[PDB]
Design a protein around this ligand. Structure first.
Ligand SMILES: [Cl-]
Ligand SMILES: [Cl-]
Ligand SMILES: [Cl-]
Ligand SMILES: [Cl-]
Ligand SMILES: [Mg+2]
Length: 380
């Protein structure tokens, strides 16, 4: 009866009969509680749904009787993208809930960002805003979903691995016990699965800023520093904080128009006794050679600062910044993949006096809240 609440990037439905509880049985929607009636991969209309397994309502009745608050957590980015009308999705949800026959609270992530599984925004909303202030025991709760990162063929008729691991990673981020729909409703044996190679729980603020520690970030005399690394991974921030703040001239090629004005800019800075930093995407030998030649012509050293971030680390950082930094320029996946395809590690043979390695590390001076968010998986 309480009904729908609309927030900027979240919809919440609370059915008649919902009660706050200290334990929750939460569920994905698409491919977990429902599937297409049509038997197609994608629904042909808002009415193209059926309950996934006939075992489902009995299990839900049993959970409700044991005092579990029933909740749905669903990503519906089609709403934010303008492809799926919110008011049509709302109707579909009410129809599904009527068929399931038990009171549910539903939370819908309409956009990318904090609320989009696997990020735990919807859980935090449930706990902080939508459970009448009752603390929820995560250990006594459960999340059930089909985006579980399962390997192909976990059952007759599925030569296709799970498209996503977002449901399993949501549970991991929150600390919730997790099960697939088949393990949960049908008591099938656990299916084999894979986690992402990069685990953001492993990202430290520890260790040296750069290697070798015996080297110095700055030179007293003119030089050209060439920064190498994936975009959106913190290169420019590091350069701003450590070099530009020390008076290095930020020479940006993308905005100088042509090679000629760039080289001229570089040369004028050097002639003035200044140090120069190139903060661009310089993934391969030919990209970097231009700047090395400029240094050589000017008779100044060229050093490389090689930022260690991997593609998945960089993409993680990008998403984090999208979620937390109003000034962040979102780096597209195409830019990331193009960089990786072109990447050749810097070597001294290119003409560098030395190469410093800049380990991928958590930034200092993120507040505690942001650090907790940083360690969450943010893509399934
Ligand atoms: Cl989802
Ligand atoms: Cl979605
Ligand atoms: Cl688990
Ligand atoms: Cl200077
Ligand atoms: Mg699903």
């Amino acid at each position: 009866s309480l009904g729908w609440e609309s927030l900027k990037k979240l919809l919440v439905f609370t059915a008649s009969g919902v009660k706050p509880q200290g334990k929750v049985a939460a569920f994905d929607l698409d491919g977990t509680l429902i599937t297409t009636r049509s038997g197609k991969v994608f629904p042909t209309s808002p009415s193209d749904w059926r309950i996934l397994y006939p075992e489902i309502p009995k299990k839900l009745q049993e959970l409700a009787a044991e005092g579990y608050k029933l909740v749905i957590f669903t990503n519906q980015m089609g709403i934010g993208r303008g492809k799926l009308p919110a008011e049509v999705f709302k109707g579909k949800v009410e129809a599904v809930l009527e068929k399931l026959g038990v009171p549910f609270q539903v939370l819908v992530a309409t956009h990318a960002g904090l609320n989009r599984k696997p990020v735990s925004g919807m859980w935090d909303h449930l706990q902080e805003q939508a459970n009448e202030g009752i603390p929820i025991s995560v250990e006594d709760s459960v999340f059930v979903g089909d985006a579980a990162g399962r390997l192909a063929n976990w059952a007759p008729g599925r030569k296709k691995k799970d498209f996503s691991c977002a449901d399993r990673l949501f549970a991991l981020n929150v600390g919730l016990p997790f099960a697939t729909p088949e393990e949960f409703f049908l008591k099938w044996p656990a299916a084999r699965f894979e986690l992402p190679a990069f685990d953001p729980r492993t990202i430290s603020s520890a260790g040296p800023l750069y290697l070798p520690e015996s080297s110095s970030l700055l030179s007293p005399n003119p030089e050209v520093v060439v920064a190498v690394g994936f975009p959106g991974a913190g290169k420019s921030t590091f350069i701003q904080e450590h070099l530009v703040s020390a008076g290095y001239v930020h020479v940006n090629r993308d905005t100088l128009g042509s090679w000629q004005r760039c080289v001229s800019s570089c040369q004028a800075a050097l002639r003035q006794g200044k140090r120069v930093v190139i903060d661009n995407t310089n993934p391969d030998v030919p990209s970097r050679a231009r700047y090395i030649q400029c240094a050589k012509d000017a008779g100044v050293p060229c050093r490389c600062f090689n930022f260690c971030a991997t593609i998945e680390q960089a993409r993680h950082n990008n998403r984090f910044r999208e979620m937390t930094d109003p000034s962040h320029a979102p780096v597209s996946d195409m830019v990331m993949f193009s960089y990786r395809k072109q990447f050749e590690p810097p070597t001294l043979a290119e003409g560098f006096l030395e190469i410093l390695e800049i380990p991928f590390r958590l930034q200092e001076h993120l507040d505690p809240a942001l650090q907790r968010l940083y360690r969450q998986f943010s893509e399934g």
